[PDB]
UniProtKB/Swiss-Prot annotation, chains A, B:
Compartments (UniProt record): Cytoplasm
Catalyzed reactions: 3-(4-hydroxyphenyl)pyruvate + O2 = homogentisate + CO2
Native species: Arabidopsis thaliana (Mouse-ear cress)
This protein's encoding gene: HPD
Family: Belongs to the 4HPPD family.
Superkingdom of this protein's organism: Eukaryota
EC code: 1.13.11.27
Chief location of this protein within or outside the cell: cytoplasm
VOC domain boundaries: 12-158, 182-334
Example of a GO MF term: 4-hydroxyphenylpyruvate dioxygenase activity
Protein name: 4-hydroxyphenylpyruvate dioxygenase
Amino acid sequence: KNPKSDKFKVKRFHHIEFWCGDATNVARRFSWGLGMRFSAKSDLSTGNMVHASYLLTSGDLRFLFTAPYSPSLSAGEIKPTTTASIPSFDHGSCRSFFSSHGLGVRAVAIEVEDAESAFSISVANGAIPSSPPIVLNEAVTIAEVKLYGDVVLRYVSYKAFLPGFERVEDASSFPLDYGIRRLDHAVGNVPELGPALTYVAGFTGFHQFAEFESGLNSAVLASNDEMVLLPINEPVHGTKRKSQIQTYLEHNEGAGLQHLALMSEDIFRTLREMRKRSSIGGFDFMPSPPPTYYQNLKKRVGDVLSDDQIKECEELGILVDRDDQGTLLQIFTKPLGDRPTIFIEIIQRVGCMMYQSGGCGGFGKGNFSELFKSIEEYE
Amino acid sequence: KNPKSDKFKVKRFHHIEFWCGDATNVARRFSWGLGMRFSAKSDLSTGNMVHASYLLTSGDLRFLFTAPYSPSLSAGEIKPTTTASIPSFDHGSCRSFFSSHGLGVRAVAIEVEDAESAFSISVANGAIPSSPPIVLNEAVTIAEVKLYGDVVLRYVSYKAFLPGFERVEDASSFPLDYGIRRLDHAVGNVPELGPALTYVAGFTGFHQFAEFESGLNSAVLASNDEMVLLPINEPVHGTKRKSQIQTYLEHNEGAGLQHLALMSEDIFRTLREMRKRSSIGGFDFMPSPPPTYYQNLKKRVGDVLSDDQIKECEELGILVDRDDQGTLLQIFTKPLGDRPTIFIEIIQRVGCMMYQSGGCGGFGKGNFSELFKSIEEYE
Ligand SMILES: Cc1ccccc1Cn1nnc2ccc(C(=O)[C@H]3C(=O)CCC[C@@H]3O)c(C)c2c1=O
Ligand SMILES: Cc1ccccc1Cn1nnc2ccc(C(=O)[C@H]3C(=O)CCC[C@@H]3O)c(C)c2c1=O
Ligand SMILES: [Co+2]
Ligand SMILES: [Co+2]
């Protein structure tokens, strides 16, 4: 059931912005670890005396890394005279965010038809405003509302990256590519799922995406065509094993973005390339499941994957899940930074062809029981 | 002239500690860019609820990257019950340092015979105490005094990395090596050279190392055997071209560490390997000099380098200087992070064999005039 109740026209995920203490080192690490090319910049070299911002791209995926300069460089400026390319940026907000949460996502940005309208309708329907609509060089409009914790939902609309950003020099722009193509979903952890859902569904009109002792309850909000997917988790307390959602909330100092799921056009190539670089500056992956997991895969997905595709999952630690319509290949990195908070998921979806429908195969919640089962019986 | 006036016994540079907002991403970037192996850690996985600290090593060079966790993780602790492995660490000091200066060196650490004695003698001779001597697991003693800005000189002495640090798992520890072997010198930028020299020479007994419109005045303080080398720069104002020391002070919010010089056993291999990785997560280098610079090299160092070693300098952008005793090969990276502040120098010294004497060939200040000259005549 999809009531298509969006209160304004939503297109696709546009970008994800990390707030950093040093954008250069985070961006360079991410570029090498994920195979994303340096595509645009806004910084001292482009006249921006406020913040350093670097954009990485892989296919349609856009990762933005931003950090503040010394406020003294821009102390003479006022908002009408700002050299910032992202007018919502605030030194104090950025420093407070990173000292509170460490490295993490500040903005989940979606492209809309009309960012001023999206902002107005959102706030009229309960959204907490974060930054009012601002038109950039008469070409792009950006507005922000609170999503959860200190994460904002950013609306971007284009009349025709952002004004004031410059393209990166070819010598400075090495064409890395490990097969990642777009953001599939972005997941938040909150203390209470009910109020978080009521709030976000309330101001967007996003609807609950149909699903099918893991320490969580979750639900997924989705746009009309179910290409913007925003799952939200809450912890389940009292368990023997402590909820990883509760661990997140403690180390993050509250609610925030838990993981980003990046769609690959070839998850096997992506995982070969990322795993090659794990120990030389890239990303680590969670501990692989025991062989019983892959032994149990023939009974579960033998009609979708060959034996030569299943043992290849075993080689790379890929997980597999399935719903009524499609099949999901997924794997999770270790946390992206110092704290056990944000991580990345790599995903490939098989099925639901009409183009592929959104969320084809679900989000892998069956892998919770399947992993525990495989572990126990592996003993 | 070397009066050998050290007020306490100094051995060698021991490590350099960067204060970061996220130690993981900085350490992984540096490891790949410089060919340094992950060697030890102190973090949540080792029981440290205070700070995340990661050690990179290449030969005798030790780079430590530290960032604070949420204070809430350790709010029940007191200094007698701390889980920090570096007892001088303070959340507030670290967050203040990184918000003020961005990514940079907090501690220049030298190994001494007796860190408690070094601290006491230093403070008795005018050193401003930063952290009193503390004995770690009855095995290592660490103490800190102010050096310049918010940079400390850290004394480390061993009765026999640090207690509480654990060695990094072999699978997590990839044996990168581009030929870097030790720290040659560490350079500070200050507003006024005179008072900075009087202070540091005053409490160490370090002596002025003999030298031979660049925007700076500088002097070098050295230990008895001239293996601990601490150059200090001040800006020269009024010039046509603005002093890079003044630019540093403005963007750094005052005095701090300007550059680290890393000795390579083979600067050609090091620069080939680093330059290969510049655009894939590593470090960039300053713009190469014009061909007139390398055309002028035969007249200056033709008795030390072959033609096949000189054009190889041209290929890699290596600079060359010479004093009365030895020859210096050097090159400079672009700034290591967002701000135009700290950078790295790669160095190889030729000559002064007895082992090699310290500072053999000087610090390359002739390359200031030689670079400008080559540029002008290249036109
Ligand atoms: C780390 C850990 C700790 C305890 C037990 C298991 C594991 C490892 N693990 N197993 N199965 C998973 C299945 C799905 C997902 C998602 O993507 C989610 C999503 O997208 C929306 C719905 C909520 C999800 O959780 C994730 C993270 C995992 C997972 O992390
Ligand atoms: C970036 C810039 C801007 C203006 C003009 C020239 C350049 C490039 N440049 N040329 N020659 C150099 C020669 C030596 C050194 C050192 O190592 C120092 C040292 O170790 C102690 C003594 C003080 C030094 O400066 C350095 C950084 C450079 C250098 O940076
Ligand atoms: Co997911
Ligand atoms: Co130098």
